[PDB]
Design an enzyme around this catalytic site. Sequence first.
Site, PDB file in Angstrom:
ATOM      1  CE1 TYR A  16      -3.773   2.327   0.380  1.00 10.82           C
ATOM      2  CE2 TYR A  16      -2.349   3.426   2.006  1.00 10.82           C
ATOM      3  CZ  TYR A  16      -3.480   3.436   1.182  1.00 10.82           C
ATOM      4  OH  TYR A  16      -4.307   4.540   1.159  1.00 10.82           O
ATOM      5  CD  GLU A  38      -7.080   6.985   8.607  1.00 16.78           C
ATOM      6  OE1 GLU A  38      -6.967   6.604   7.454  1.00 16.78           O
ATOM      7  OE2 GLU A  38      -6.305   6.692   9.502  1.00 16.78           O
ATOM      8  CD1 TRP A  46      -2.975   1.866   7.285  1.00 21.43           C
ATOM      9  CD2 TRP A  46      -2.980   3.827   8.389  1.00 21.43           C
ATOM     10  NE1 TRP A  46      -3.170   2.902   6.390  1.00 21.43           N
ATOM     11  CE2 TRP A  46      -3.179   4.130   7.020  1.00 21.43           C
ATOM     12  CE3 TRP A  46      -2.940   4.893   9.305  1.00 21.43           C
ATOM     13  CZ2 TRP A  46      -3.334   5.443   6.578  1.00 21.43           C
ATOM     14  CZ3 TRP A  46      -3.095   6.218   8.862  1.00 21.43           C
ATOM     15  CH2 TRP A  46      -3.291   6.491   7.500  1.00 21.43           C
TER      16      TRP A  46
END
Length: 187
Positions: A16, A38, A46
Amino acid sequence: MERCGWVSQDPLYIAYHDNEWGVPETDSKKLFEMICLEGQQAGLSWITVLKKRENYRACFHQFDPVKVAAMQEEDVERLVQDAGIIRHRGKIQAIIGNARAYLQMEQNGEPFADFVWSFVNHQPQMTQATTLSEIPTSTPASDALSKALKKRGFKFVGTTICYSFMQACGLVNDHVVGCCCYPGNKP
Ligand SMILES: [Zn+2]
């Protein structure tokens, strides 16, 4: 060669990192998808958000954005049956509201994505921090940006989610000085 130390492991995160992360994005859909997903990191790591991020698209990407703004409370309750992603009818409701506030910005022909860009003086920001600790998570634009989204009625805009937005959105370039892509003294 040198690489970003943001990732400690999980090869999926590094993939990513190379795909984007740190690359300024001007697409309204990409920014909207980032601020909404988010919020999932809150409490979660994350890496957990990226995996669910793909599943989230399976339930929302197919419906597109304009559709959620045109959906009713029964639609969020109906999809709740599938929990491939974190379960929270309340969070899903925020998605519908996100499209409603976002669509209103387009009515004037002024994408809300352009609005956030104005908060940073439409100018890109860059940093030459050496260690992740050197990178400050408290910036005048991040604090003001959160207040702007809060006024729109956006939820999950904690200062942490706001800083993460610039990081993924690419508004600011934070890749220490050992990521090759960021030299700091090699033009
Ligand atoms: Zn990097």
